[PDB]
Design a binder for these strands. Structure first.
Ligand SMILES: Nc1ncnc2c1ncn2[C@@H]1O[C@H](COP(=O)(O)O)[C@@H](O)[C@H]1O
Ligand SMILES: Nc1ncnc2c1ncn2[C@@H]1O[C@H](COP(=O)(O)O)[C@@H](O)[C@H]1O
Ligand SMILES: [Zn+2]
Ligand SMILES: [Zn+2]
Lengths: 199, 199
DNA sequence: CCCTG
DNA sequence: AATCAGGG
DNA sequence: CCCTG
DNA sequence: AATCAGGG
């Protein structure tokens, strides 16, 4: 009905989309249409019950889905993911370098209704990263890493006013107040530095 | 030294500026470079002491200057002013129509340092009127009309937070919140209505 | 979610 | 250039 | 004051 | 599109 159901077509009809880089009966790996890092993918369950379950509920009470998703990411999709990353970053990056530069998690408050796990590089260098909320949502407790212990899931209390905070580089700790454009330029430098040291 | 002395050249060297439409030893009438109404003029004293006196002090303690300025506006400059107005609005407007559509006053807090009296039409239809503070500064107590009794001069207390208020049409009382662009379009309509009824 | 004003 | 309402 | 970002 | 910091 609304924009919030936009991801639905990927799990209904993955055979129709070239940016669906993997599908089977259970899951779909699709490119993020508005990548917030050089590589940004979404792993979606095709299970019609679970797809509408809130990610925090998934983390709390659906561990078997959580384990399955992790199995895909470390297993049958790992080669695929490393290749996407090498194409998006550099061919000269090894699996080990890439593995330490990739994060996997749910947003604590999704906008899209179909459950989707973000798998993305750490750089946050991207034209689609256009505002502070974008950046903060992937670099704060709002981003719930897939290996978060259940007792440490973020709470309504801990998330309060999170998008209003000063901008901080995830890599070196430097602060930028609310100067989003300054952060952007800094992220670019951080990426060039990391790339040059990693190739 | 700064932009705040920009009006100075008009009283030093009125002979150098075609937009100085009147000068003598005592005063200068010059077009406002950024008119906030269809007609917007500035009347400046050439007296080197008084030019730097704050307008509220002028109103309180320099009545003879106040009376002289008013004498110019109603006397030797009246024909000149009506012609400027007819050229800026419409040739079909009589002195009487124009007289009731013109206001004369000081800003309570000037940005320019050389004392200048605003003489302008009421329309506030102008490309140079670009923000709410512009509009409010000419349509609130911040605009100190030249015939304000001294006991009713605005105070620091009365001016507080004035530029943060909702926008109100000076002619019909309609409110626009902070929708400046909506006010603009409305002012245009108000002007067409007034013009059509006045010609 | 995004875009536009 | 950062912040925000409206609409899809 | 204005303009630009 | 409204609000604001910086600079001239
Ligand atoms: N039509 C689309 N196709 C693919 N990805 C999308 C589409 N629309 C939005 N997205 C992404 O979906 C993600 C939703 O994240 P969330 O904030 O967790 O709901 C964001 O990263 C968006 O860039
Ligand atoms: N260089 C200039 N020449 C003529 N008028 C100007 C110039 N710069 C600014 N102004 C006007 O000077 C006025 C100053 O008003 P105030 O806010 O009372 O200081 C405003 O109406 C400006 O548009
Ligand atoms: Zn950094
Ligand atoms: Zn009105």
């Amino acid at each position: 009905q609304s924009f919030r159901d936009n991801l639905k077509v990927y799990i209904e009809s993955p055979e129709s989309y070239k940016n669906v880089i993997y599908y089977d009966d259970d899951v779909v790996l699709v490119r993020d249409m508005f990548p917030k890092s050089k590589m940004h993918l979404l792993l979606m369950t095709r299970d019609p019950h679970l797809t509408h379950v809130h990610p925090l509920e998934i983390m709390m009470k659906h561990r078997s889905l959580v384990e399955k998703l992790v199995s895909y990411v470390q297993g049958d999709l790992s080669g695929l993911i490393f290749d996407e990353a090498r194409n998006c970053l550099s061919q000269q990056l090894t699996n080990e370098a890439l593995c330490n530069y990739i994060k996997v998690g749910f947003h604590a408050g999704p906008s899209m209704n179909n459950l989707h796990l973000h798998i993305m590089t750490l750089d946050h260098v991207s034209p689609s990263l256009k505002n502070s909320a974008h950046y903060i949502s992937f670099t704060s407790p709002f981003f719930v890493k897939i290996d978060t212990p259940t007792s440490n899931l973020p709470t309504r209390g801990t998330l309060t006013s999170l998008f209003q905070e000063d901008l901080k580089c995830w890599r070196c700790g430097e602060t930028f107040g609310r100067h989003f454009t300054k952060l952007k330029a800094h992220l670019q430098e951080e990426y060039d530095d990391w790339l040059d040291k990693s190739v």
